[PDB]
Structure 1
Amino acid sequence: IVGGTSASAGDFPFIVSISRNGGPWCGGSLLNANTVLTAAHCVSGYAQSGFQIRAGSLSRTSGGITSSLSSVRVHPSYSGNNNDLAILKLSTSIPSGGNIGYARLAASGSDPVAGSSATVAGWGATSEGGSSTPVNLLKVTVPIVSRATCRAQYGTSAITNQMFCAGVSSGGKDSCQGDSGGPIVDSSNTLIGAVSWGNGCARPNYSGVYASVGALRSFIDTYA
């Protein structure tokens, strides 16, 4: 997270940190006791054994409840940067209560409205190319970018309706490497997306790009 602030206890009760090979890697959203929503590019093709989930902590290293993975279901038509979602099943159930809770998903058919305020959280880099990764969770608030504008930035082909964009035209607030898979929420704390991709981080004129929960509810509701 670039241009962000420290998250408070309880801000995102459903957020999970995903480590790989004991090192930081991605974030995710707890859908229910045995199910995590992340980015496909977090898990696709990699040894499943490498992954650990941690819930109910501001720290990616300590506290809360941990689980290994029993299974990985990548979106059947995950393709390049598109349909960048995966459902993870947990060997250890993660019950709700305390600072643990489950994500409220964006309505099927919904698409975040340009100009509306979104909040993204994670444990990734605090600048593009940065080598520090926070131990404690950060968050940042950014406006939704019109798909038309995002198409201008990236090309029409690059941006589908299974993606949306968020960021600030003068740059300096974004998700970054190590944030992928983690939650982007609306002003009501509804899960609208997962951190997916971008040209660098927080660049003026290159929005952060998110996998759209509203577009991909079929996939999610099936396997959740």
Structure 2
Amino acid sequence: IVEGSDAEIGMSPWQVMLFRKSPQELLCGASLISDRWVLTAAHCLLYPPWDKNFTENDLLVRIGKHSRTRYERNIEKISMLEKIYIHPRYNWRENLDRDIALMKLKKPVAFSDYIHPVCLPDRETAASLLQAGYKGRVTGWGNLKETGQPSVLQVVNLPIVERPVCKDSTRIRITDNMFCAGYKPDEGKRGDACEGDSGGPFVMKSPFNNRWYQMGIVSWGEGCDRDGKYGFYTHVFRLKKWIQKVIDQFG
């Protein structure tokens, strides 16, 4: 996270860490959506040009964490993966369309003060909250700058941008399955996600019911926190039908 701040303990209890087992390495972020289901970005798991085509056996997840490096006895829980699921229509050659993946844990994770799922949105919430100018929150152990890594989980709040401004910020074919957030150059304030934040959540809190909803998945930016550039997030609601298909099948 660029220009963010340390999370308070417990501020983001759906925050998940995705590790490669061997060599043990932090790949991406991700979010707890049930007691067996974790949501990340596809490109976190599948990107051939960067030698990334993982199976369940390759990875594990850590949940309940605050510090990037230091282990946390009785807080942190490590989980094995039963099965990875990547959207069938995920595009990686071009534009990162449908950058969405689901992971099933091999065991239910126990909830605590540090571990707790986030809500997926519905039509009402998506219509209410996905408006330009409205701010959401992005978290992660990604870099603090474009060119070290943070000691503790970072958090930053960012305004959703109007589609035309998104469209014009990049020459990447942008799709209706992503939105962009971040400040315009004239707005003075800064901040963005960066390398390592991928797959983590973009959450908003509902004024109707006081709950946290995951509106986006951190997907891509050209650099971090550049003027006239914006962050791109997978639109969770537009893909919710797939999320339900997988979870409802469990397989």
Per the normalisation by structure 2, the TM-score is 0.83
Residues 166-185 of structure 1: matches in 2 within 5 Å? 166-170=181-185, 172-185=190-203
Which runs of structure 2 are paired with 1:8-23 in the superposition (5 Å)?
8-20=8-20, 21-23=23-25
Of 226, 234, 241, the match for 1:211? 234
Residues 121 and 137, structure 1, Cα contact 8 Å, conserved in 2: yes
Q: TM-score, normalised by structure 1?
A: 0.92
Aligned match for 1:49, one of 46, 52, 57: 57
User: How far is 1:47 from its partner?
Assistant: 4.2
Q: Which runs of 4+ in 1 moved over 3 A?
A: none
State the match for 1:27 in structure 2: 29
Q: Partner residue of 1:73?
A: 85
- 1:134, 1:19 → 2: CA distance? 16
SS of structure 1 residue aligned to 2:111: coil
Which position in structure 1 is the counterpart of 2:104?
89
Look up the equivalent residue of 2:216 and give its one-letter code: G
Distance 1:10 1:98 in 2: 6
More helix by share: 2
C-alpha separation in 2, matches of 1:17 and 1:88: 12
Equivalent pairs counted in the alignment come to 221
CA offsets 1:145-193 (integer angstroms, 9 cap, x no match): 11111001114x6211100110112273000110000011114431101
Change (3 A) 1:87 1:190: same
CA contact (8 A) 2:90 2:98 kept: yes
Shift of 1:93: 2.1
Deviations 1:27-60 (A, max 9, x none): 1011111110000000122243332211112124
- 1:176–1:200 Cα contact (<8 Å) kept: yes
SS at structure 2 position matched to 1:136: coil
Letter of the 1:51 counterpart: L
Counterpart residue identity of residue 174, structure 2: I
SS for the counterpart of 1:68 is strand
C-alpha separation in 2, matches of 1:99 and 1:113: 30
For structure 2, the 5+ residue unaligned runs are: 47-52, 207-211
The alpha-carbon deviation at position 108 of structure 1 amounts to: 4.1
- In our comparison, the structure showing a higher alpha carbon Rg is 2
1:159 paired with 2:191, answer no
Give, in whole Å, the separation in 1 of the partners of 2:123 and 2:219.
Answer: 19
Task: Read off the aligned partner of 1:115 and give its amino acid letter.
Answer: G
Contact 2:55 2:84 (8 Å CA) reproduced: no
Contact 2:137–2:203 under 8 Å retained in 1: yes
Q: Secondary structure at the match of 1:13?
A: coil
Q: 2:38 aligns with which of 36, 40, 47?
A: 36
Is the deviation greater in 201-210 or in 104-113? Answer: 104-113
Q: Structure 1, unaligned stretches of length 5 or more?
A: none
Asked if structure 2 preserves the Cα contact closer than 8 Å seen for 1:54 and 1:60, the reply is: no
| Contact 1:66–1:92 (CA under 8 A) maintained in structure 2 | no
Matched residue SS, 1:150? helix
Bigger drift between 14-23 and 34-43 goes to: 14-23
- 1:125-149 Cα deviation digits (max 9, x unpaired): 00113xx222310000111011111
Preserved contact between residue 184 and residue 195 of structure 1 (Cα < 8 Å): yes
| CA distance in structure 1 between the aligned counterparts of 2:30 and 2:8, rounded to whole angstroms | 17
Q: Which moved more, 1:187-196 or 1:207-216?
A: 187-196
